[PDB]
Amino acid sequence: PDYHEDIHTYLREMEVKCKPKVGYMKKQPDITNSMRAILVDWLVEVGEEYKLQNETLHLAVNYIDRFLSSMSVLRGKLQLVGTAAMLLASKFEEIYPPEVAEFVYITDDTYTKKQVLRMEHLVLKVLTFDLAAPTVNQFLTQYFLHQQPANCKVESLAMFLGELSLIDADPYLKYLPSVIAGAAFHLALYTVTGQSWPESLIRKTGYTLESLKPCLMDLHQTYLKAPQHAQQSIREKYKNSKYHGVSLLNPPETLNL
Amino acid sequence: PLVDMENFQKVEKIGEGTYGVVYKARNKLTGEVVALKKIRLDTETEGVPSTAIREISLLKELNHPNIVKLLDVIHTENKLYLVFEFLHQDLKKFMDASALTGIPLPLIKSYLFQLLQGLAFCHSHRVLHRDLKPQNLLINTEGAIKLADFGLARAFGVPVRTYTHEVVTLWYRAPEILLGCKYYSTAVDIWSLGCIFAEMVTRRALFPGDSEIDQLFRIFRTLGTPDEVVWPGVTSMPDYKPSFPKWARQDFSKVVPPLDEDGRSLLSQMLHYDPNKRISAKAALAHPFFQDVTKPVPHLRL
Ligand SMILES: CNC(=O)c1nn(C)c2c1C(C)(C)Cc1cnc(Nc3ccc(N4CCN(C)CC4)cc3)nc1-2
Secondary structure (H helix, E strand, O other): OHHHHHHHHHHHHHHHHHHOOOOOOHHHOOOHHHHHHHHHHHHHHHHHHHOOOOOHHHHHHHHHHHHOOOOOOOOHHHHHHHHHHHHHHHHHHHHOOOOOHHHHHOOOOOOOOOHHHHHHHHHHHHHHHOOOOOOHHHHHHHOOOOOOOOOOOHHHHHHHHHHHHOOOOHHOOOHHHHHHHHHHHHHHHHHHHHOOOHHHHHHHOOHHHHHHHHOOOOHHHHHHHHOOOOOOOHHHOOOOHHHHHOOOOOOOOOOOO | OOOHHHHHEEEEEEEEEEEEEEEEEEEEOOOOOEEEEEEEEOOOOOOOOOOHHHHHHOOOOOOOOOOOEEEEEEEEEOOEEEEOOOOOOHHHHHHHHHHOOOOOOHHHHHHHHHHHHHHHHHHHHEOOOOOOOHHHHEOOOOEEEEEOOOOOOEEEEOOOOOOOOOOOOOOHHHHHHHHHOOOOOHHHHHHHHHHHHHHHHHHOOOOOOHHHHHHHHHHHHHHHOOOOOOOOOOHHOOOOOOOOOOOOOOOOOOOOOOHHHHHHHHHHHOOOOOOOOOOOHHOOOOHHHHHOOOOOOOOOOO
C-alpha cells in the first residue's frame, strides 16, 4: 500500500489517545475484572452467533473499557453497556448491523429495546462519538503485510492470541494495541514457523523483541493457561477450520528470549 | 442540547434526501453562518443511523482545509443535528451553470489540486470516502473546494468489504467494483476524481452508464477492454465474463481534447485499470500538471 506508513504512524498516535485508564476497575465500586471477562467472553459468543467481524468485537471492547473508565456501573447494568457497545461497534464496522431487536434477544430480554437505545445514546455521549479507535486487529493487519511468505496459520494464531488478550483486563489494559499485536504476531510466527519478530517490523514499529518482552511473557502465559481459563468462547471459536484449528496448536514451552 | 438548537436560526433549506435535511442557519449569538444537517431519528426506530455513526466519528478526525468541517454535534432524544461549516455551492450545479462557457482550465486545475489534497488527507488517515461525485463536492466564492457527504465513508485500518446497497452512483464507480472485487481500496476514490476531472474539462460525464454492465462497457469502449497484461487478475474477478467485447483503447487526446500532455498523463494514471497501479492522491499532487497551479475564483451564479 501507498499510505501504509502514514496510516501506521497515525494509528500509533490515536491508540495513545483512545486509551482507557489502566486502573479503572479498582475504582468501580460494584464490578470487577472477572465480570468484565465474562462480558467479553459473552460478546465473542454473540459475534459468533450473528457472524460478526472480529474487528467489531475489538471495537466493542474498546468502547466498554473507555465507558467504564469514566462511568460507574452496577453488575446488572454491565451487560446493557456491553450490548450497546456491540451495537455501536456493529453499526460502525459491519456492512450492515443486526437489528436492535437482535441485541434485545441476545440478552434474554433482560433489557428493553428502549434501554438499549438510550444506553447507545449515553455511550455515544460518553465517548463523544469517537468510535474509530485503533485495535489489535488493525495493527495485526498492518503487520501481516510483512510476512515474506504470507502464512494463514500464523494469521489465525495471531488473531487468536490478540483476541484472548481482550478477555483479561489484568494485565492487558496496561499495553497498547500495537504492542499486544506485536507480541501476538511474533508468538504466532514463532509457534508456527519458528521465525521471530522480523527486522522489517522492527524498523516499521521501532519495537524490538526486547521491547515486546514484557507483553510477550504475559501473552505466552495466557496462551499456556488458555485451556484452563474460565472463559472459553474464543478457544471454541478458533478450533474451527476457518482458523486452521490454531487454538488446538500447542504453545511453545518457552520463548527463546 | 436544546439550548444549542435554540441558538440556531434556520435560514433556508439547502439540501434534502434519505438522510434528512440540511439548512443554512445562523448562530444567533455569534453570527456564524453554518450548515445544519438534521437527521430524523424516529423514522425507523433503529437508533442512531450507521451513516451518522460513521460520518461523525470519521469527520472529527479529519480537519483539513479541503474537507468540509464538522463543527458540532447535537444529540437530543429524537433529533440528531450535525453542524458543518457552510459553503456556497456544489460542483454539480456549478458545472451545469458553466455549460455554455466551460470551467476555465486554471480553475479546473485548482479544484483537482485541492480535491487531491483533501483526498490524500482522508487516505493518509485511513478514511475512504467512497462517494466522490460532483454534487458532494462543495465550493465557495474564494476558490476553495472541499469534500463533503461522508455518509458512505469507512475507516480501513482493516480492509473494507464491498456492499451492493452502499456504492457510489454508477457514473463515478471504479471498474473493480463493477467487476465484483472483494474489498474497496483507496483507488476507488481516485477513479471517481479522474472521472470528475474529465467531466469538468469536457463538460460531459466521462462514463455515463445506464446500468452496471453498460457502465463497464462505456469504460471498456474508452480505455479498452482490460486483459491479464493490463490488469493481472481481471479474468478471474467475479463479475468478469469471457464474452466481454474486446475494445481497443481510444486515443486519449480525443477523449479529453482540451487537455495538454501533462493533463492527459495525470488522467491516464488516475484511470489505470489495475487498482494497485492507479496513482495515489499523494503522488498525483506531485504530478507536473500541478506545477503552475493557482487559486482562481469561480463566477458563482447565485
Ligand atoms: C448528505 N449531504 C449533506 O450532508 C450535505 N448536503 N449539503 C448540500 C451540504 C451537506 C453538509 C455535509 C451538511 C455540509 C454543507 C455545507 N455547505 C453547503 N452549502 C450549500 C449551499 C447552497 C447549495 N445550493 C446549490 C444547489 N441548490 C440549487 C440548492 C442551493 C448547495 C450547498 N452544503 C452542505
